[PDB]
Symmetry: C7
Subunit: 281 residues, 7 copies
């Protein structure tokens, strides 16, 4: 309550002035506009009080224009057609055409109301944060009522309709906990298992002495055994950032990869192709 305390008063004088000239007027026309220049301004604070409650400084005011212009009609269309010109003669012709214009504007007022529920109720992002929509990572920079505007990782600008987004799973990197990496690598199946044990102990020591980039808990995983030739391995570890910071994620993971590369060849681990027999005729 900040402005309703002083602006609802501007409807309150007319709430006083429709009780004034009803007793002095009835000791019908000007009697019946005083309650319709009031029925608007009471329908006007139900706007401003149920819209000083609400999730975007662009879409809240593109919404305010929308309910103002449909409550500056259901005042007027009940002023003339329900309070001055007498009822039930033209009151049931415009309701064919009102019902007729909901074969035209009906499906696109359906998409406007599903976009208001996506933006204000479901609310999966704010301006400024990096999101994933199909597998495409995209930064938000404008939220309108019918469209979100995104930037891609190459800075290309995308216009996406909010009613199509309202049926999809959306990721948000800004609202996430600190996120995890994968680095994969392959070694020879005939690596001794004491060298796989020294490799694991040496990975874990690299991550303990870099606490500012990596969390301490990790795992080294064997994923496949191929042709009795190849072990496919992976390392799982945790960042101290999310993937909101795209450039910093790529740089820290480049440096982890080049450190694994150096451990593998201090320990004399490699990979070799399967031998081939040749029958020479």
């Amino acid at each position: 309550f900040r402005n309703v305390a002083q602006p609802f008063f501007n409807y309150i004088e007319e709430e006083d002035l429709l009780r004034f000239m009803i007793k002095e007027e009835v000791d019908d026309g000007a009697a019946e506009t005083g309650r319709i220049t009031r029925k608007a301004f009471t329908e006007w604070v139900v706007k401003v009080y149920t819209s000083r409650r609400a999730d975007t400084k662009t879409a809240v005011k593109q919404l305010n224009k929308l309910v103002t212009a449909i409550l500056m009609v259901v005042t007027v269309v009940i002023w003339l057609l329900l309070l001055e010109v007498a009822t039930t003669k033209v009151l049931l012709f415009f309701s064919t055409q009102l019902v007729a214009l909901a074969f035209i504007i009906g499906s696109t007022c359906k998409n406007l109301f599903e976009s208001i529920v996506f933006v204000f109720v479901m609310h999966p992002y704010d301006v400024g944060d990096r999101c994933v929509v199909d597998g495409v990572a995209m930064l938000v920079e404008e939220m309108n009522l019918l469209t979100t505007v995104f930037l891609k990782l190459n800075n290309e600008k995308v216009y996406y309709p909010n009613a199509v987004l309202a049926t999809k799973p959306i990721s948000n990197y800004f609202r996430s906990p600190n996120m995890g990496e994968t680095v994969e690598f392959s070694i020879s199946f005939s690596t001794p298992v004491s060298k796989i044990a020294h490799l694991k102990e040496r990975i874990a020591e690299y991550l303990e002495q870099n606490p500012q980039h990596w969390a301490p808990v990790h795992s080294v995983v064997v994923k496949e055994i191929e042709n009795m030739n190849k072990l496919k391995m992976a390392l799982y570890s945790d960042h101290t950032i999310t993937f909101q910071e795209n450039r910093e994620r790529n740089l820290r993971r480049t440096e982890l990869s080049l450190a694994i590369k150096r451990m593998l060849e201090d320990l004399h681990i490699d990979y070799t192709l399967l031998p081939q027999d040749i029958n020479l005729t």
Copy 2:
């Protein structure tokens, strides 16, 4: 019955006070609000008694706000339009616009009611458990009425609409029995069959002496015969956990894989590529 025993009384005094000033009032207006300041509070306990029956401490109260605000209207709209201002003049104009706002809000009240059936009736998960939605494993951490919030295995946070989830098969790892592994490996077709018999007997002995990780019953399976060169094999066995514990599943299966690797080379089993003839010109 805990609070209805003392809060239904707050409707009961008004059930006494509408029988009071009907006899003293009829030895119409204030007669006709006493049954509408009652018709609400009887429609209010049908809320609180059919909602102290119900499957989320966030969604039960986001639901309570929803039926409270539509039963704080079908009290008022039958107070004014069916109990004070006399009927059948404005009683059949608002029902065009009521029918008109179900070309707007109709499809999105359809998705709100399908999301309430998914959450409270179908109920496939609770907060805290790991689920699979397309092939993506995802931990639940917030259940709302229109959206479930998930975390992925890299801790990325996903906002998924509940009306799209209500048409899909959903797995739940927490509600499962103890789950099974597969480890695949390939050996040479000309492996003698006494070495395949020693391999099977040595696999089964590893699983019997590790009862805390593996169940005793398992099977070793030949899946293909390729080019008279390669036998493709698999081992099926059972965990003593489900896949809810993701990090522990990967670690126990890494250790099973490195044990198969060591059996295969104690028994001198290998795999070799097919020979090649060379005609040298």
Copy 3:
């Protein structure tokens, strides 16, 4: 007829007691509840007699709760609105809102009625049997009205909505005849045709002396001729089980594969790669 012979009587005394105080009452209110505390209990045995006819001990009683609660309304809503408070004043306002709540609950009562036809009329499975839904084999363990609960071959538990299942082809391994195998293998194109004739005669002798696992009728098939190098062959034979018994199917087919492997090398059949010319510069 077991309980209807003694429980329809509890409606029959009220069928006697509405003919009693109609003659003593007419030598309107208490006259008009005696036929509505009867119209329920006659609408109650049409429940219990057309539901002691029916295909799940969980879904029959989750269904009984559903028709009981809509026949404990179309008693009451014709008691008050068609037998006590006089007609055609409020009788045509609630039928806007009744028609209004079929933009909300209408599509989800459509899916409830398609799920009752799938479960009770189409009836493709029972609890306990192994089924195939897309290519995924799945054991049934709970049939509800809106959801079937499955277990996969790794024991992961799946919640599948019955209205999506009602549009798919569903296999049932339990209701099947004894099922057939395929084992494929490849041999060299320049295998003499007297060795293919000894191979066929030796396959058929293995299947005749194992009658407890294999049926006698089978076929050995040539499927492709490749590059004048490779014959792709298959063996088709029949189990004495269905694929309901998953672990036993895999074990018996592993033993057939290792027996083919031993026939092929008693007969000196192999496969070789195409030769290569080398021009040495």
Copy 4:
């Protein structure tokens, strides 16, 4: 006309007995059941005469139960609600709920009527014949009104809904003419063209001396020229069976393939890989 000649008489006595006590009764109630215990039995022979016209001995009688139970209602609901209890008071309340239960049962009476047109009008198969639905060959063994039951080539049993089948192309091997084979093979591009001419003449002689399996007309086709290395060829010929006989088709085509294999090496035709230059450093 076999049973209608003697069973329409059982409506004819009541056609005589409603003309009897209309003149002796009018020299209203028992007058108005005599034409409704008649209006059924005339609506009963329009059943039995337009259903002794009709394409399955299971589905004709699952259909007879269906129209009997909706003509044992539109007798009764015009007996009570249009011939005894006087009109236009309850005659326009049940038609809200009748219109209400076509938001529930309406889409599933839509699928029941599309399944009756598929089974009886479109009629693409009978019980006992082998059909192809997506590329899957399937034998029919039960035709119901809502589901067809199939067996696959491994004897797995499939339950397929008839309303999904009614939108697909369906093949029928039993209703087909005698069907054609393809056998493909590859030869060397530098095969002389007099050897391709002897091969064609020797294929055609094999098919003339086996008239009981193969038709005489055939074609030998060159499909591609690859890398100036490989000619891809095919032989097209005709069976004296359809593919209804699955096991016999596979056996006769295995024997054609092994005969092509023997012609190719009597004529000294082969295939060789492209040569390779080696620069030895």
Copy 5:
């Protein structure tokens, strides 16, 4: 005009006999069947004159049965319900059930009317001609109102619903001009360009001396340059037939391919693989 000149007379005598006993009858019942045993036979020639206009000798008469049986109802249902038993009492009950049976039979009368527009108005084929539906070539042999029956190139018989065909592109080989071939072949990149010029001149001479199979205008096209190793080429030419004649198309194109094969090796053109360096350790 052949039969309407003598069969419209059989309605004309009743056009004379309803003007006869209206003056002798009015100097109401038998007055009001004479105009309904006329209103049919005038509605009967509007059938036979607007159906002796029309595109299949099976579907025209399966259609004639369909409009005869709905004009042998809208005679009777306006005879009894609009010309004998007096109006507006039962005239507005059957129109609930008439409106009710268009939730049942409505979607399948929608597919019957879209199939009549496909067959008679869009008309993309006749019986006997070879068509392409997805990439599958198929000969037409029966056109019904709801289904077309096809044969494939292996003589398998397909039942295809006409309402699914009405949304697809359909090719017709019989209605086409004479159609074109492609033969592809690959040569070595280091082929001199005077040999590519002799090859083109020798292709064009083969096509000029075979005018009965090939049109004179053609083109020889270079499609790719690969790895400075391979030129991918094609020859485009024209048949003197369409692809309706499937067996003759395959035979003439086999003979063109074997002639290209012989030109290429008279001109000493070939293709060779890229050389390989070997470092021998």
Copy 6:
């Protein structure tokens, strides 16, 4: 204005002859056909004047037949049912069946009106021009109201429904500017960069001395660097034709490809495969 100046007169005499015998007739029947043999011929010039405005000489006249036959009904059905036989008795029965035949013919009058907007308003092609629909290039040769008839590049004739085409992107080669080529080629990564500079200067000189086929502006592009082995390059240039002329495009691009081929080997550019180490055991 050419024929409306003399043919609207044939309605004008009847505009004079309905004002004639209204004063001599009223100093009701023949009074009420003179305004309905007029209401047609005024509704007839609104046809011929709003259809001498309109984009196909086949579809304009297949359209003229369509609006003539629905304005030769809404003359007659307001002649008999609104100007001779008196109103509001049969005026509200045919409007059930009129509303009934829009469950039958309603969806196919929806596709007829979307096809008229595609053909006359959207208008993406004319007869005679080459278009691309999915990636298939197709020449137009007949435009009807419900179907376009195309020819493919092999002269196969396609019947495509206009309501499916109205939802797709359609290319038009005839309405295009002069179109561009791509020729790709690969060279060795260790090509010196002075040879890539001479190649570019020699490409550009070929295009300047052939101005009748190629525009002067072009670009030579490096697209990938592969394995430090291969540069993948492309040349982009412009035709002086569109791709309407299919045979001429293929011939001019064959000659550009064979000219690039000759530049590359005057400059001694090639491509070689990566070397291989051999450890000889």
Copy 7:
């Protein structure tokens, strides 16, 4: 306000001339056209004032023709049918046919109103700018109300319907910030890490001395480690243009690629294939 200040006057004289001959006429017909030759010209400035507000000089005037012709009807159809010929006799027959022509023209007035919201409200592009629709880059050159016309990168012209575009994500290169490049390259895993450090320092120096094409900030990224053989790397950098300038983007990136190529071989970096063991028999 430019022309409304002088053209609303042309309605204002008729606003003066309907107040003139109402007092001189009433001291009904010509009284009732003066308010309908006024009701148009007041409905005419609500056109010109709410359309001198509005996003294309072709579509604004193709829109002006559209609302002019539906406000030159809802003047006339309320002139004759609501102000001259008296009401409620023909006032409720044309509203069947008005409701009937919204089974015909209803879905295509739905697509016209969704195309007006795409063009004027969502507004994702203007004429002249390069956009991406599926992955296809396309220059805009005509915006109509129902169709956008595009040119592709080869100058092929595409006609795309605006109602299909209104459901897709659309990129706009003209409205973007300066955009980013990727160049990928592969090096040998056994490259020393001091050579990867000199490569990074030498890349960054090339980008600093070319400020007119490249931004200074960049990153060099290791993406995979393959088989202990290959490092897959990438360089990310920024243009000083967007991809609107297609030809200039390709030329600047060709020159960056040829500069990386020259750094790699000044530093003696390469890539080699994995060695092979040969067992020579």
